[PDB]
Chain length 275, copies 2
């Protein structure tokens, strides 16, 4: 298909999978918005290989090999996701380094793994979420990447910790645990408690500890918003606040994360306030 229809393919992907990020980045100007769609499609395919694919090691390495060919300028394909990403790399000075780092992060979910410390958690969050922020920065803040980089990495930490805090039960059912073992020990929340899906006072202490780290990272990220160009401030600030609002959503539902999303109306409220 042509470039317009390849980008529209990516528009469908982001709209189907993230009401938050599709709504936030729809507010960007045309070519920046389309580039975000193409970058999102790259991230979605990598994560879905590892989290939903039936042969994730072989499929992720094949994806990595395709990205190598893409970066050499030699990938000949009819895949709309690569057609769109080719244009985005041509149109904006996208840096391949965080794209490779995403793949490093996805490799971390191929085999059994225990998060021991908060440092272990941030290492994982850096490679699977902070890298997304870094992929986007040349589109969102041309010429100002080094100025906003730290806030973008920390926004990744904030969003990934939020994701983890929302998904404790979903991940448990999928035989994954991202809560640090050392905080489980600190607060006296055992593996048997977690397996029993217990929402007790120790769980809440641990959950709030992580949530407060996320809130600190969101605050640090939002402090950098004046350094973005004006046309990126509502998209980035809106994405940040809409995703942060998952935390208070869970609190308002009494920390029940073993069975949470921000309502459509609340997303509109946050976007209006940014605007």
């Amino acid at each position: 298909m042509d470039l317009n229809n390849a980008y529209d393919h990516c528009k469908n992907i982001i709209e189907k999978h993230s009401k938050t990020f599709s709504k936030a980045f729809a507010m960007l100007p045309k070519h920046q918005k389309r580039a975000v769609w193409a970058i999102y499609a790259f991230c979605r395919r990598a994560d879905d290989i590892v989290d939903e694919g039936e042969n994730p090691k072989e499929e992720l390495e094949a994806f990595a090999v395709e990205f190598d060919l893409f970066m050499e300028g030699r990938l000949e394909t009819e895949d709309p996701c690569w057609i769109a990403l080719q244009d985005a790399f041509e149109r904006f000075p996208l840096d391949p380094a965080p794209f490779y780092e995403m793949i490093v992060g996805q490799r971390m979910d191929l085999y059994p793994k225990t998060i021991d410390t908060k440092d272990d958690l941030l290492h994982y969050c850096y490679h699977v979420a902070s890298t997304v922020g870094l992929m986007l920065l040349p589109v969102l803040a041309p010429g100002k990447v080094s100025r906003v980089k730290t806030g973008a990495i920390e926004l990744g930490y904030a969003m990934q910790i939020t994701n983890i805090l929302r998904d404790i039960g979903e991940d448990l059912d999928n035989h994954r645990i991202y809560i640090p073992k050392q905080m489980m020990i600190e607060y006296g929340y055992t593996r048997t408690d977690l397996h029993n899906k217990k929402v007790n006072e120790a769980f809440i202490q641990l959950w709030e500890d992580l949530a407060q780290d996320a809130e600190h990272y969101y605050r640090n990220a939002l402090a950098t918003l004046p350094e973005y160009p004006v046309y990126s401030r509502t998209p980035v600030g809106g994405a940040a606040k809409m995703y942060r609002a998952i935390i208070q959503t869970v609190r308002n539902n009494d920390y029940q994360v073993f069975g949470n999303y921000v309502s459509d109306q609340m997303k509109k409220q946050i976007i209006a306030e940014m605007q």
Copy 2:
């Protein structure tokens, strides 16, 4: 109750929970057999606290505190398991050190944990299984403990690896994985493969690698049997060969460990051959 009935309480525990070890150690002379029953009851209660209890951290620490009081000679109780173990410590020169080490091993299952390497696996096997061998040695080989110690530790490795190899699916359903991550990577058996309960050629390669380590440890342990007193040779050799036979049982059932036990008749055959 009196001492005879306290030991009979422990006899019921071992008979209910292990046809293999009850049958093997029933062949010991009277007082050694009864001491093994009491030691088994100690190990069973510790493991069941951690693997079946609803508050395993609090309950295991309370068990540890009771054992501290027991070792000080100050535990006043009507618990038949402690009455029997008091007599066994009085009657044979039992060493408390491996009993404490068991509790260290049980603590390892209180919180999320990933076995990375074979060294990690042997560290775990030492504390939960090798320690049982060490608790028993003053009963099984009085005056000859240092001579047979290494074989007893390695018999622990052999039996625990066998247990793990039989229980991969049972442990997975309980959100535990004891297969080393580095062997999963070596053989290309992913977390998604394991979650999918796939019995493929990579699984079999990994399973056989561990089984061959266990077989080596069984061989080393059995090589020490002539150093045991005559009355312990059939109990120890019988326990070893009956538990080893789980490995070939699984092989004969095509490695299907996601849904295996040695038949009663095969246990009798092994005991007769020892005799």
